[PDB]
Amino acid sequence: EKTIRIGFVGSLLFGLLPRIIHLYRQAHPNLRIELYEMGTKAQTEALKEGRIDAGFGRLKISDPAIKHSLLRNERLMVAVHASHPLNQMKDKGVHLNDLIDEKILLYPSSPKPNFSTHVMNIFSDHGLEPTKINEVREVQLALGLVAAGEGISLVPASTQSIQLFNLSYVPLLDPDAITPIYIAVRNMEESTYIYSLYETIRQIYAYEGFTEPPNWL
Amino acid sequence: EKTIRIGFVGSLLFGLLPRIIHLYRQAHPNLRIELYEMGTKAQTEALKEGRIDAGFGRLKISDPAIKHSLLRNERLMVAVHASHPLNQMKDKGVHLNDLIDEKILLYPSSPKPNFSTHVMNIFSDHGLEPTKINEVREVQLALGLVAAGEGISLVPASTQSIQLFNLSYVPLLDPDAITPIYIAVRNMEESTYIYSLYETIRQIYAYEGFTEPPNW
Ligand SMILES: [Cl-]
Ligand SMILES: [Cl-]
Numbered sequence: 088e089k090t091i092r093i094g095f096v097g098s099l100l101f102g103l104l105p106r107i108i109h110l111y112r113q114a115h116p117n118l119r120i121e122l123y124e125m126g127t128k129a130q131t132e133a134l135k136e137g138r139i140d141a142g143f144g145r146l147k148i149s150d151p152a153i154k155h156s157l158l159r160n161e162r163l164m165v166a167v168h169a170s171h172p173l174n175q176m177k178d179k180g181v182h183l184n185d186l187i188d189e190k191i192l193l194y195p196s197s198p199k200p201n202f203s204t205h206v207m208n209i210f211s212d213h214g215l216e217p218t219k220i221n222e223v224r225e226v227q228l229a230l231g232l233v234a235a236g237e238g239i240s241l242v243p244a245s246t247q248s249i250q251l252f253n254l255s256y257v258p259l260l261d262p263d264a265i266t267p268i269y270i271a272v273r274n275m276e277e278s279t280y281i282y283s284l285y286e287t288i289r290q291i292y293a294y295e296g297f298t299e300p301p302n303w304l
Numbered sequence: 305e306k307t308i309r310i311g312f313v314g315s316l317l318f319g320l321l322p323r324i325i326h327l328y329r330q331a332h333p334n335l336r337i338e339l340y341e342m343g344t345k346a347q348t349e350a351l352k353e354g355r356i357d358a359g360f361g362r363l364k365i366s367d368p369a370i371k372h373s374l375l376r377n378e379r380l381m382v383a384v385h386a387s388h389p390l391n392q393m394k395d396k397g398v399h400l401n402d403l404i405d406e407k408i409l410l411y412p413s414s415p416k417p418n419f420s421t422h423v424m425n426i427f428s429d430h431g432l433e434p435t436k437i438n439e440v441r442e443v444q445l446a447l448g449l450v451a452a453g454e455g456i457s458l459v460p461a462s463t464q465s466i467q468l469f470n471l472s473y474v475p476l477l478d479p480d481a482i483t484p485i486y487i488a489v490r491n492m493e494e495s496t497y498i499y500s501l502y503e504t505i506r507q508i509y510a511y512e513g514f515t516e517p518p519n520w
């Protein structure tokens with residue numbers, strides 16, 4: 088069987104994932120690559136059942152039947168309307184403690200734990216308690232709503248692929264204001280095709296100029 | 305009390321709708337604005353059932369309880385990988401009949417009729433039958449898949465708010481390669497807040513150099 092099945096959180100298409108898949112396809116003309124959008128939690132049973140072979144997700148959910156490699160962390164940004172006071176710090180950055188009384192749009196609306204779990208945790212980690220929280224379906228909706236004046240949202244740096252009139256991305260300076268990208272696979276030896284996918288990720292990351300950590304992939 | 309409820313197709317947040325909503329909000333400090341993401345089909349029933357007061361959609365479903373106003377037509381474009389042959393005539397543009405042997409990604413997967421209905425209809429309208437079609441959930445899936453090398457996609461021009469590495473947007477030349485933007489309200493709707501909403505649309509459109517939408 089020359090088929091590999093890859094699960095991915097949809098919003099990862101705003102980042103390096105499409106470049107990775109494009110290079111992978113080029114490297115493997117005889118391979119059928121099937122792409123399936125699914126939340127990070129859903130990738131656990133998909134891997135266990137053999138419905139996907141590798142899953143690109145935004146957190147690590149422990150299950151004995153699967154294993155994980157952290158690919159990288161993205162910086163979080165604060166998406167704001169251009170008229171917001173916070174946008175005056177567009178070039179400099181702000182901190183989590185500048186955000187606690189703002190209307191924050193969280194996402195996605197899929198089962199917990201999800202992307203938003205870590206976002207709320209980094210507030211809790213420093214004794215900060217956001218007083219105005221709303222959950223919306225997914226990140227590009229949150230961004231559109233921010234542009235419409237509905238509030239602010241903490242978003243991965245990769246979401247800057249989306250640029251909207253009077254939408255601005257403000258850096259978050261807290262060193263832990265970051266969000267992980269993981270690759271998850273079955274808890275067994277990776278296939279030749281999955282090992283090749285690892286090498287493709289390495290190559291794209293090298294083109295981006297990322298420094299590899301020790302014993303990476 | 306006092307509240308206005310606005311239904312909208314999610315992808316319309318990539319165009320002028322947010323700045324319309326924001327300008328409108330500024331003019332009404334006492335107004336609660338509730339925004340609801342929903343497909344154009346759902347807006348019709350939501351309007352008849354009183355769950356929204358105005359719907360911004362991408363097609364017209366005729367119903368005697370609803371009245372529509374065509375705000376404008378967006379040009380359709382072809383999203384392609386940078387290396388695609390179609391991307392060699394981005395300046396001059398291509399026609400629908402140039403797309404027929406390509407793998408076309410349709411969207412969204414919401415109930416029909418939807419954006420993809422008109423897309424397939426404009427091909428059918430000229431005796432063109434795309435030989436390879438696949439439906440995906442919504443526009444960003446299509447764009448990512450195009451960027452990943454899986455095919456091409458027809459998208460509204462406002463989609464260009466999303467820029468991906470090696471993703472290019474090619475104009476279409478067919479005069480009917482367009483997609484409408486409608487506002488829909490209940491037939492006997494005469495609220496001052498709805499009047500104000502239409503005037504806000506008018507002001508935003510005027511500033512962009514567009515034609516004034518139809519009369520109240
Ligand atoms: Cl998301
Ligand atoms: Cl628009």
Ligand SMILES: [Cl-]
Nearest residue numbers: 393394395396
């Ligand atoms: Cl040309």
